Design a protein around this ligand. Structure first.
Ligand SMILES: Nc1ncnc2c1ncn2[C@@H]1O[C@H](COP(=O)(O)OP(=O)(O)OP(=O)(O)O)[C@@H](O)[C@H]1O
Ligand SMILES: Nc1ncnc2c1ncn2[C@@H]1O[C@H](COP(=O)(O)OP(=O)(O)OP(=O)(O)O)[C@@H](O)[C@H]1O
Ligand SMILES: Nc1ncnc2c1ncn2[C@@H]1O[C@H](COP(=O)(O)OP(=O)(O)OP(=O)(O)O)[C@@H](O)[C@H]1O
Ligand SMILES: [Mg+2]
Ligand SMILES: [Mg+2]
Ligand SMILES: [Mg+2]
Ligand SMILES: [Mg+2]
Ligand SMILES: [Mg+2]
Ligand SMILES: [Mg+2]
Lengths: 506, 148, 74, 59
């Protein structure tokens, strides 16, 4: 690896990518952020992993939290630190103040702490260190001048010592000054900023690497989530464009359609269903999950519009028994509101559900549902998200988008995703003689030939019936077409008088 | 209640942010869907005739079935029209029916079948020789049959 | 923050009434809405015919239209 | 016909029945004088009408 600084892996989902390999050995990273941002966890996880994966003991210096609690809380993610503190793989160093204390102690004890830590490290043979909340210490009676010289001592000696330290820091505003005394930012080799931006009452946490003296790293903010497994990051930009492509084809669940698509959809591909409300996207999706089951392959449906109940109701009335799909262990419906958490979260649930079920097909009914409230950029970023996972995992995907203006919409995107999509499916209304008929259309397929016809279609208990095209109509797309006839009566089956039978006999 | 109705959620959307509104909706929608309550909602499209969208803030999505009304300017007159736009679990009529309004209520008559561009409020009457083709004078190929 | 555990993240609108603080986790509520093929009239016969028998009971029907077309009526 | 003529219409009344046609009308020193609807025109609403001049049923 071409970098000039030897880094050490945190084993934290996404960090070592963002930090181009992890924290530089022998230096110190200032991970700081507001309140409830992830700070201590990040440090805890940092020590942990170095212990559960490299057998590198580590010293943890707590300043405000109690040595008991640090163990109490760590269990939340399933970590028995007590067991590690026991096996001497993790020494916790308690420097918390006292409930019956005096007043005055943050300088010579700083000369003492260095010596203290030097003992732990020397005794436990530690290779990693985490000082949590240094801030609280100066928080006795100090200003920027005593902070730059005092930290520095620590860091520096720690560096000589040869320990790869991590320091936490608090900071009032989310975007203003990195740290409190606005000084910790320059004494450190590396600075990591955790944020919990508000915006629209929801909450988006992000992690960012302002600086790594000596190497390069991923720039700007990257969204991470805190699960029962700790921090988890999405380098939604370190997502290289190197997924596999196969001319393989699969069923849509509608046979006349498969024709319209040069012989069925492509396996490695992104399918986009767009149409005004009530046209039938939802449907095509169903017949898509269904068929993936009628072929003994797994697939998941993530509904953000209708319930797991109602999704089954309309599915049966359309034929296809979803009840069984569930039992046969072939189809799984997720179902959830977009307002039940910001994108970063959703994007993960979806991934989650794709690793615990390994589907070979996946449907997301109404991406434009998730676009509720969210700023395009944030949506477009999430769209590249899902899309990007399903593309490097041989997991055909059918996204549904509902257009905000029926009849007369000049773009089947509204959010402008029509470039991420490999193949688009188009549904829309057609006012034909006072009636609201639907018609489908295959707008684009990257590798196939597909049918250029705008065939009309009708729905029955049976499904999407693909009929013929309005050859005798101008201004189709317009919603309310114009009738111009050169024929119509032309053959096809002229012969007048008695042509039919009735129900008795034929 | 066994049924619930809110006249003009568009009456609430006054002032308030879109997001708040959209949220409010889920806020009354889901509570109705779980509580076994059949609910009907009222929305006033800001522009009469031409309306390329049926709601405003884009609520349609959190809806099972749509019943819409839209004036149709016919022969110098402002008349009504209703149409079940979409129904998720049912069949429902595709045709756009006109309707009167008197002392007994609504009488959904026929759809303007001899018209074009109805969704636009101002249609294009197009009878000019109805479906009987230019063969209304049956050519005269029918001058063989009657003799003496 | 609730060190040690999880929790719902974001703001939630609560109302201080005559029954103390009331919060509405508008996101919490799940998408597990029971359903049935049960239909119900509207008050307009023909209308029910255009729907397919009537609006289902467990449903959300939206009556949209310009001002004056008769949503109130319906 | 190249002229800016008027029109009046009771768009909606909540109790009554009110007239459904768009009646033209002119202004004189005697005040408004409502007239007859443009029965034979199209796109009245838009403002820029279009006469149908439908050739009857063409006999
Ligand atoms: N299992 C878990 N699943 C989801 N979230 C969790 C879990 N455990 C803890 N959290 C969340 O992690 C956060 C805890 O933050 P942490 O104690 O690690 O340090 P901090 O917020 O950076 O600093 P401070 O000591 O000032 O709180 C809380 O906001 C909490 O909601
Ligand atoms: N049993 C049925 N028989 C005949 N037509 C049906 C039946 N169920 C639904 N339909 C038709 O299909 C439409 C329902 O649309 P669908 O459920 O496929 O999803 P959508 O239009 O993509 O999205 P959304 O319904 O959320 O707006 C109705 O508008 C209706 O015309
Ligand atoms: N007794 C009646 N006879 C004939 N027409 C009536 C009668 N009452 C009301 N109307 C008509 O019905 C319409 C009244 O609208 P309605 O009360 O149904 O509510 P809306 O159209 O949904 O909303 P809004 O009243 O604010 O426009 C009027 O436009 C009018 O033409
Ligand atoms: Mg905090
Ligand atoms: Mg902490
Ligand atoms: Mg749907
Ligand atoms: Mg919808
Ligand atoms: Mg009104
Ligand atoms: Mg009203």
């Amino acid at each position: 690896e071409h970098q000039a600084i030897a880094k050490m892996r945190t084993m934290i989902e996404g960090f070592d990518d963002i930090s181009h390999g992890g924290l530089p050995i022998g230096r110190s990273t200032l991970v700081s952020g507001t309140s409830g941002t992830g700070k201590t966890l990040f440090s805890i996880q940092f020590l942990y992993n170095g212990i559960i994966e490299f057998d590198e003991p580590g010293v943890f210096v707590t300043f405000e939290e109690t040595p008991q609690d640090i163990i109490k809380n760590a269990r939340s993610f399933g970590w028995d630190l007590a067991k590690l503190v026991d096996e001497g793989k993790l020494f916790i160093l308690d420097a918390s103040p006292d409930p019956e204390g005096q007043e005055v102690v943050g300088g010579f004890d700083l000369s003492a702490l260095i010596e203290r830590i030097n003992y732990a490290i020397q005794k436990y043979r530690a290779r990693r260190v985490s000082i949590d909340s240094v801030t609280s210490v100066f928080q006795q009676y100090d200003a920027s001048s005593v902070v730059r010289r005092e930290l520095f001592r620590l860091v520096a000696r720690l560096k000589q010592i040869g320990a790869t330290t991590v320091m936490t820091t608090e900071r009032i505003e989310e975007y203003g000054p990195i740290a409190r005394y606005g000084v910790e930012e320059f004494v450190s080799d590396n600075v990591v900023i955790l944020r919990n931006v508000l915006e629209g009452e929801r909450r988006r946490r992000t992690l960012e690497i302002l600086k790594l003296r000596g190497t390069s790293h991923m720039k700007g903010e990257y969204p991470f989530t805190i699960t029962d497994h700790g921090i988890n990051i999405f380098p939604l930009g370190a997502m290289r464009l190197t997924q596999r492509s196969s001319n393989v084809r699969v069923s849509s669940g509608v046979v006349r359609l498969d024709e319209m698509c040069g012989g069925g959809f492509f396996k490695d591909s992104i399918i986009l269903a767009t149409g005004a409300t009530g046209t039938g996207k939802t449907l095509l999706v169903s017949r898509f999950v269904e068929n993936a089951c009628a072929n003994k392959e797994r697939a998941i449906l993530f509904a953000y519009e209708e319930s797991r109940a109602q999704l089954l109701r309309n599915a049966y009335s359309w034929g296809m028994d979803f009840e069984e799909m569930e039992r046969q262990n072939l189809l799984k419906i997720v179902c959830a509101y977009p307002e039940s958490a910001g994108l970063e979260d959703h994007l993960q649930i979806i991934k989650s559900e794709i690793n615990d079920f390994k589907p070979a097909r996946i449907a997301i009914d109404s991406l434009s549902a998730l676009a509720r409230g969210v700023s395009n950029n944030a949506f477009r970023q999430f769209v590249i998200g899902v899309t990007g996972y399903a593309k490097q995992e041989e997991i055909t995907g059918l996204f549904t988008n509902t257009s905000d203006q029926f009849m007369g919409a000049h773009s089947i995107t509204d959010s402008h995703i029509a470039e991420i999509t490999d193949t688009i499916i188009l549904l829309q209304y057609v006012e034909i003689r006072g009636e609201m008929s639907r018609a489908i259309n295959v707008f684009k397929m990257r590798g196939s030939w597909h049918d250029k016809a705008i065939r009309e279609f009708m729905i029955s208990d049976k499904g999407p019936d693909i009929k013929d095209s309005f050859r005798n109509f101008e201004r189709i797309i317009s919603g309310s077409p114009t009738r111009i006839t050169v024929d119509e009566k032309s053959e096809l089956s002229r012969i007048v008088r008695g042509v039919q039978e009735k129900g008795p006999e034929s």
